[PDB]
Amino acid sequence: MANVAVEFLVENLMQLLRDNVELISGVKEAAESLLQDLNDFNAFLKQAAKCHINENEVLRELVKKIRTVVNSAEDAIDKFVIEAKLHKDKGVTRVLDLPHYKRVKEVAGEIKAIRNKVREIRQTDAIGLQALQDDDLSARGSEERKPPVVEEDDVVGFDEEADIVINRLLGESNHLEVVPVVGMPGLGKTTLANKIYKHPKIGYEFFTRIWVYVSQSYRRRELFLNIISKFTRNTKQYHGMCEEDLADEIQEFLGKGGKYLVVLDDVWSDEAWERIKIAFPNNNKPNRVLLTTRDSKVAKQCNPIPHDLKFLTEDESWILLEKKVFHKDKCPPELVLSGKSIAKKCKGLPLAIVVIAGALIGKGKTPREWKQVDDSVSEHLINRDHPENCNKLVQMSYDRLPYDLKACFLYCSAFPGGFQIPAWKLIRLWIAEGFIQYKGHLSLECKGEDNLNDLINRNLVMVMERTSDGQIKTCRLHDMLHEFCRQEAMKEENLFQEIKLGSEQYFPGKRELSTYRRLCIHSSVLDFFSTKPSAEHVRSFLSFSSKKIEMPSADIPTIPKGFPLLRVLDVESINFSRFSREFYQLYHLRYVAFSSDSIKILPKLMGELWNIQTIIINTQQRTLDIQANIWNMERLRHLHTNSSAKLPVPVAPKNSKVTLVNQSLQTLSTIAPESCTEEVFARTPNLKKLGIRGKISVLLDNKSAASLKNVKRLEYLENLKLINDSSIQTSKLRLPPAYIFPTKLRKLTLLDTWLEWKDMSILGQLEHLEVLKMKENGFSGESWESTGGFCSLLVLWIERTNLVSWKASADDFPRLKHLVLICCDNLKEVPIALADIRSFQVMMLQNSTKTAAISARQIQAKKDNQTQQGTKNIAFKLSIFPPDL
Amino acid sequence: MANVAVEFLVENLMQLLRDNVELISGVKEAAESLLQDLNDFNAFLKQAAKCHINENEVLRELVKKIRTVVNSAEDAIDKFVIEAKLHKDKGVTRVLDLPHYKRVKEVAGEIKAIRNKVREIRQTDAIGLQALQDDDLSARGSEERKPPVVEEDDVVGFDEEADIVINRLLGESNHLEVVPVVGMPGLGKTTLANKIYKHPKIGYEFFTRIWVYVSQSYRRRELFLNIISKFTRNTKQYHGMCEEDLADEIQEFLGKGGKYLVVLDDVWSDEAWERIKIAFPNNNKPNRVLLTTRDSKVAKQCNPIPHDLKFLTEDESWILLEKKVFHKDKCPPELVLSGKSIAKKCKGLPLAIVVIAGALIGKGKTPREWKQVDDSVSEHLINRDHPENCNKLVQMSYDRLPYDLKACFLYCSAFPGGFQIPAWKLIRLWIAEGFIQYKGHLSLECKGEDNLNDLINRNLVMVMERTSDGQIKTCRLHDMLHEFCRQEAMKEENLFQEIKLGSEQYFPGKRELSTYRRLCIHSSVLDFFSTKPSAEHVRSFLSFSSKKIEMPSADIPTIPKGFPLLRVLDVESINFSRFSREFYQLYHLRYVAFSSDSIKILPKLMGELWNIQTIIINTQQRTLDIQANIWNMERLRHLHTNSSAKLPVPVAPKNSKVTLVNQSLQTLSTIAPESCTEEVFARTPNLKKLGIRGKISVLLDNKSAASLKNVKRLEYLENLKLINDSSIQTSKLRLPPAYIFPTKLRKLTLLDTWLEWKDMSILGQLEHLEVLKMKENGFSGESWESTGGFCSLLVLWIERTNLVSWKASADDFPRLKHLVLICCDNLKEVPIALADIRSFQVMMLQNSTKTAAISARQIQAKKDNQTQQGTKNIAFKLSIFPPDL
Numbered sequence A, B: 001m002a003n004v005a006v007e008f009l010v011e012n013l014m015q016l017l018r019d020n021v022e023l024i025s026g027v028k029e030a031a032e033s034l035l036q037d038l039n040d041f042n043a044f045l046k047q048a049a050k051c052h053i054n055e056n057e058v059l060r061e062l063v064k065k066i067r068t069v070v071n072s073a074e075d076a077i078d079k080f081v082i083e084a085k086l087h088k089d090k091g092v093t094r095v096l097d098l099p100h101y102k103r104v105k106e107v108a109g110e111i112k113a114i115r116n117k118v119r120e121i122r123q124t125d126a127i128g129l130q131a132l133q134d135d136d137l138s139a140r141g142s143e144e145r146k147p148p149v150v151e152e153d154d155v156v157g158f159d160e161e162a163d164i165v166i167n168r169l170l171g172e173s174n175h176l177e178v179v180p181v182v183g184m185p186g187l188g189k190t191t192l193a194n195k196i197y198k199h200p201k202i203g204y205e206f207f208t209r210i211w212v213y214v215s216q217s218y219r220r221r222e223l224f225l226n227i228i229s230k231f232t233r234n235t236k237q238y239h240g241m242c243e244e245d246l247a248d249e250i251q252e253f254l255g256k257g258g259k260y261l262v263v264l265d266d267v268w269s270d271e272a273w274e275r276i277k278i279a280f281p282n283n284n285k286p287n288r289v290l291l292t293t294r295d296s297k298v299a300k301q302c303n304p305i306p307h308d309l310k311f312l313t314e315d316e317s318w319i320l321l322e323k324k325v326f327h328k329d330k331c332p333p334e335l336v337l338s339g340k341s342i343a344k345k346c347k348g349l350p351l352a353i354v355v356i357a358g359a360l361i362g363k364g365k366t367p368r369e370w371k372q373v374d375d376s377v378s379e380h381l382i383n384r385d386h387p388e389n390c391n392k393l394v395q396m397s398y399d400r401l402p403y404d405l406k407a408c409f410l411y412c413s414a415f416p417g418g419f420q421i422p423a424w425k426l427i428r429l430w431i432a433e434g435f436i437q438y439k440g441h442l443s444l445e446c447k448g449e450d451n452l453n454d455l456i457n458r459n460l461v462m463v464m465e466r467t468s469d470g471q472i473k474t475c476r477l478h479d480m481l482h483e484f485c486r487q488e489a490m491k492e493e494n495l496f497q498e499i500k501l502g503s504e505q506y507f508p509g510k511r512e513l514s515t516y517r518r519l520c521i522h523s524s525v526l527d528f529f530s531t532k533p534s535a536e537h538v539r540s541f542l543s544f545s546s547k548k549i550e551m552p553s554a555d556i557p558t559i560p561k562g563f564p565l566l567r568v569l570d571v572e573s574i575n576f577s578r579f580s581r582e583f584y585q586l587y588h589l590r591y592v593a594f595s596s597d598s599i600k601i602l603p604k605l606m607g608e609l610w611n612i613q614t615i616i617i618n619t620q621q622r623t624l625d626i627q628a629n630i631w632n633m634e635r636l637r638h639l640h641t642n643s644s645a646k647l648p649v650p651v652a653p654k655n656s657k658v659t660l661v662n663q664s665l666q667t668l669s670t671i672a673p674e675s676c677t678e679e680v681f682a683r684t685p686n687l688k689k690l691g692i693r694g695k696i697s698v699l700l701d702n703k704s705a706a707s708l709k710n711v712k713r714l715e716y717l718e719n720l721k722l723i724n725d726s727s728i729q730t731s732k733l734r735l736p737p738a739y740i741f742p743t744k745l746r747k748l749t750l751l752d753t754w755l756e757w758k759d760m761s762i763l764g765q766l767e768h769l770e771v772l773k774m775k776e777n778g779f780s781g782e783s784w785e786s787t788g789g790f791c792s793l794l795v796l797w798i799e800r801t802n803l804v805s806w807k808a809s810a811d812d813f814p815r816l817k818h819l820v821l822i823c824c825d826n827l828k829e830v831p832i833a834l835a836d837i838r839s840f841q842v843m844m845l846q847n848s849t850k851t852a853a854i855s856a857r858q859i860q861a862k863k864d865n866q867t868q869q870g871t872k873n874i875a876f877k878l879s880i881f882p883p884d885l
């Protein structure tokens, strides 16, 4: 939508005028003029949006060229800004910088012609404003939306295929067999196969169970490395071994672990199965493979008997729609006939019905909306076999979205097919692109999380992984939605364009690449950069690859010089050895991610990019030294890192009264303990997440820095992590008293502190802490005895400890819901008093002593009797690692 | 040929037995038995080769099974070598090395199994050549092959096509019309183009003329870079800007010098034309493009009138056949009729005439041989349209090559089709690959050049360029010939395999790779190594990519670990930042050629190797410290580079009587001036080609360590090159006395020495000097007065010198043949006395004063008058790069 670009340009111009007067100084009148005209433009596009522009040709004619004239302005202003900052570097103290001030004033001549153009067009727009304001529709207020807790996890009317499949498997002893499943896209082969892979009988039967996704763009060796990973810890060794030997190693590991069930998803080409099957050892055991698909030929080839999936009958259809649109509550009677007619209109496709329930949630729950939706569906599914019917249905759902979500959905279609989207990165990309604008009081990140939850609710985006906290950790887009969104973006809106290279084709020429605004290259990238492209109007550049590619020493300069107007640059999948000066000459850079293996210092010139919001760095060295004045970069909001970062020593200005305290700074992913000082925390009042890697001892000792005591100043801090990199128990470490920590702290992580279990009382004293995660021998001992305090703790996580005896009472953990016990191969039993807590719902116990498993089964039987006893308890689910136990 | 493999194994086994008793100490008995078995079986293989091999299957089966055991013996022997060297590396002083000595005894058991297999072949038949001994064919002696002679520079029957093409240009000025040349394969379009391009009218008609070769796998950017690099000297910019901008610059430069005539060779598809045609924007000038295409559709798309290359007429065909087979001499009357039958059977395809001429010259000059050849040609040229006729003719020609020369002719397809092959690289490769073996007294490289001349004489190898010396410089195979050799090698013999992946195809599995003995890649080797392939039976690797490519630091150790028995490592188009230690266990390496841009030190572990013969490095480091002990490598024949290599100080051991005098060394291209001490020359009695690069004044001055005086000691030196990197003239340099130079010096090159023409007398005194090359103001001054001495000189190269006045008489250069003057914008006139030099053959003049051009025209007129007077003076040739001069 043109509104997005208009708003972003207005905001950036305002920020540049307020903040940096000197750069814009030669053209201030033109800046203010463009500001007024863009405000008026935005109002006009809103008024046009109120109407159905597609209904009138004149309205559609009017919108065109609103966007091009706006685009011409953005270009001229940005070129001017970069030119004048280069002038500042020139340091021409001449009063009249006649040489090359006439170049920045050539850009200003373009600016002036552009201001003249914008003054025009605005006069024509004033014509037809009154006529447009005569008409309006959908005059209503805005309501709230609510978080997407799990709902309808049960699968309507699909027990039949589940039981048939679970029956078929385990037929012939000592045979490696494959179970094909087919059925048109959106039917639910993955959903049913998930229900199988999570049915109790399957987990009872086979010990090893691997979930594997194999699309068309799948890679064989990438898959083998990960499957070997399922068994062992490190794959960096097998980065240097052949696929065949890798196939052999997977075979040995998989054969060792008794039986095995392996799931490969959405296969496309029979040769794909032919190649992948090698790793599986046919060692004369009843091991079952479960592949699903869409094409019939491959299913038939891999086994002469494919099990075809089934459509949902009319009743299943209506019940499913009722569930999705009305969630737990039951439908009010008046809409029943409408909903049943729509369900019948669907023909029993779970995908069409699901998206339609999303559209109904979007419209409302009033009879007029239901009748209109019924009429529209009765029109857009006249055929069955044509997939574009699903596209028409999704378009109908899509039309009702707010334009802000319209931008986010398309931009979520940017990622490659089959790629699992990291939610935090997706939110930060949305922020840096300008799709989320200040409205209200929520922090930008919270608004982004709410937007993602909204998109999940109407069933456009399917969630894949969730956190311990219950939040979302990784999402993606179903194939049909990906195709519809990609076509809509690359064709209509020109949001972005992709450059995947088919056989016997060439990367476009400079004239074509001239008309792009964003690039995505998810295929051979070094090949596009060996050509030395040049497109002055590329603002973003995305490359979400699978492997890590090295960048040749003679090829580093190409990105900075080819695209001198970047804003977003995510090349996390490309490893750099260094950087060139043109890099530090990129002055519009907002988002910047990159990897590296020999980087140790963040050069100081990097602090001259005065618009950076986000920074993400990967480095193999333990210590990363930062020399750029991050206290100078006003708008910095995040600084991620995987090594231990050594922040610079802060100094306030001497001749300037102004103090350097960043109000908008929310993260310091991993800083060294040496910098956990009073001043570092004086400068970050609003900090919400902090991490410290290094030798946690320096913190805990009270000589060098009362560092844990320094932590008291961060009032809003809500997440902390203590990572120790020393591998030597030089002394014993002691946590300070529980009045030093912040009050809202909600999630803590320890790793190799090696603390004594008596200190757990201090943590019990904390009030709001909701998740405790101690990994890799965080607390050392053999005797912990609960002493109360964990009033609100919701998830407990213990991994790689030598604890033996634990003792508690049902009043120690009143709100427990989740309990994680990993790699505790020296614990004996879990206290049974944990079976008394009502909310205790999920437990898991990995690589643990079998006596603990027997006690856990006792606890499960206890809670089963409780729920049987008429209490309104939440259902009980257990998990014990041993297949036998 | 299998005899080649048997002989290679025999020679290596004898070498290993002689040099190191320890390496074969455990299995010396079976090794010697295998050696004698190989000798007798090679006698058997020769006896088989005496009888027809192509026509008999049982005979091939007899000799077959011996090649397999020979390959297996090679594998096991190299395995034992690497294993014994690994034992040495372990440095176990135990009398009984309980770990790994049983593994080596099992490898000895494998060696004994191969010995048993060879003895089993001998048991099946004591010799197996009794039937072969009964029948003998082709008994005759081996006589001389003539030294190469440039001959038949005239083209027969294509002059009328040349006239028609030269009538095409001047068709319509102020326009761009493409000339299409269309013909069947081996027809001679490219010869007609190479003629017309060389026509005096063409050079006079256009000041600028370009020759461009459009292969099937052409890349546009590299072609444009070549066109640009033609005109200018500096290209640091054009490596940085894009191919659209590159074509724009090509337009600019071709328009700077007015009208131009460019040639595109062997256009295959239409897209080639559509994309290359944008680089010739007509500047409303009379511009012509010459396009040779085998296909016709592309020609019609280029221009609705393609120039149709006719077939040779019968008389033209015969004059060709007699010229080729007989060279200057005419056809003897008795062979006239057999020749006429052969030529009339050729159907006019000149390539058939040429290949049959090669077959005749190889066979001999007797009527029975001519009749046999004619009958075969009749038998195999029944049809007309099928190109496979040429494959059949080539097969006839090939069955007659000497088995050594057969192996030589083949494996030339290992170099990708269409690639100019440096002759020196081919010769050194043949030497390293055991292809050329010690037979007689000729030096290995001399025998290699002899073989290459022999092949070229047979007209199976084409020469692209020569030298003022007239020595072959670069050679390439014809398209059809390259295709034939490719199919031959990859199918019937298994000399090498070409891993060229389509879009669908994937790289081979390790299983397929197991049966390969030589690898040739010509597509992405980066991706090939990305799959991390492995192979033990691989001895040769070649990848002639067009560009230079980097090896990611994680991909560096792939080649060693995958290939532990590597001999020929042809990776010169690959870049190496560093080397894994696994490189330094490749005890089977014979040939190492590789690039780099940061390598400053060759590690001492490089010296550990012993089997290498050639070392080749092109680094951009101005210095290259060589810390390997080269003096301990006896078989080092060649250490080629372009850097100012600083050799290690030759130190004799304190407790050894062995003289570290390497009797195999032949060349030290660009050693450091500091490294020219009496010792290093004293270690190399047989040095043949030397050149220095660095601070040469350190060589000249007597106070300085007298390097140039010591250079006398090399009695076998024949090639000397002196190069100065010092751009600063801190003093004037003076040459030593004439006697100090080696007696047998024959070619000299001077760059950046800025000598004083008064010294030219000293160089005159040199008795044997035959090539002189002064460049980069080699001699600094304004007036030259030649004083004689250059009795045996033949060619004179003057480039970028500020000479003003030259005075010479005909008595100074009685035997000289070639004058050339590059960029002498200072030179006034050329001594007209040089016109009296009978031997004077060809003159060239580039970017000189027009006065020199007019005086050169005077000299040309004088020579034309001389020959017009009845003197048997050789034809003279004049050429001026700018015709305006």
Ligand SMILES: O=P(O)(O)O[C@H]1[C@@H](OP(=O)(O)O)[C@@H](OP(=O)(O)O)[C@@H](OP(=O)(O)O)[C@@H](OP(=O)(O)O)[C@@H]1OP(=O)(O)O
Residues within 6 Å of the ligand: B466, B467, B468, B469, B691, B719, B721, B747, B749, B771
């Ligand atoms: O062995 P050299 O005495 O050093 O001469 C050779 C050779 O010159 P000749 O034709 O006289 O044998 C090549 O031929 P030209 O170029 O001189 O015609 C030349 O090839 P390039 O200049 O193309 O490289 C080559 O150069 P290189 O050392 O790179 O192999 C090098 O002569 P120069 O090095 O002095 O140019």
Ligand SMILES: O=P(O)(O)O[C@H]1[C@H](OP(=O)(O)O)[C@@H](OP(=O)(O)O)[C@H](OP(=O)(O)O)[C@@H](OP(=O)(O)O)[C@H]1OP(=O)(O)O
Residues within 6 Å of the ligand: A466, A467, A468, A469, A473
């Ligand atoms: O499951 P989560 O709720 O995501 O909690 C953590 C945490 O994530 P958050 O701090 O954002 O909540 C870490 O995030 P990052 O370190 O990447 O910033 C991540 O990595 P760590 O191990 O270093 O804590 C870790 O993932 P994992 O432990 O698997 O590596 C993950 O916990 P999960 O195990 O559930 O992913």
Ligand SMILES: Nc1ncnc2c1ncn2[C@@H]1O[C@H](COP(=O)(O)OP(=O)(O)O)[C@@H](O)[C@H]1O
Residues within 6 Å of the ligand: A155, A156, A157, A158, A184, A185, A186, A187, A188, A189, A190, A191, A192, A266, A320, A350, A351, A354, A459, A462, A478
């Ligand atoms: N039996 C069912 N009941 C309700 N919804 C379903 C059912 N089966 C699939 N779905 C819906 O379909 C989507 C899952 O996609 P799916 O059909 O499994 O992809 P594919 O079948 O193409 O692999 C989800 O939105 C899910 O809610």
Ligand SMILES: Nc1ncnc2c1ncn2[C@@H]1O[C@H](COP(=O)(O)OP(=O)(O)O)[C@@H](O)[C@H]1O
Residues within 6 Å of the ligand: B152, B154, B155, B156, B157, B158, B185, B186, B187, B188, B189, B190, B191, B312, B320, B349, B350, B351, B354, B459, B462, B478
């Ligand atoms: N005299 C000639 N007449 C016709 N074609 C020729 C002649 N000489 C070379 N050719 C062409 O050159 C190619 C092979 O040339 P070749 O026999 O090597 O001679 P040259 O060394 O002069 O090129 C073929 O395409 C052939 O048609």
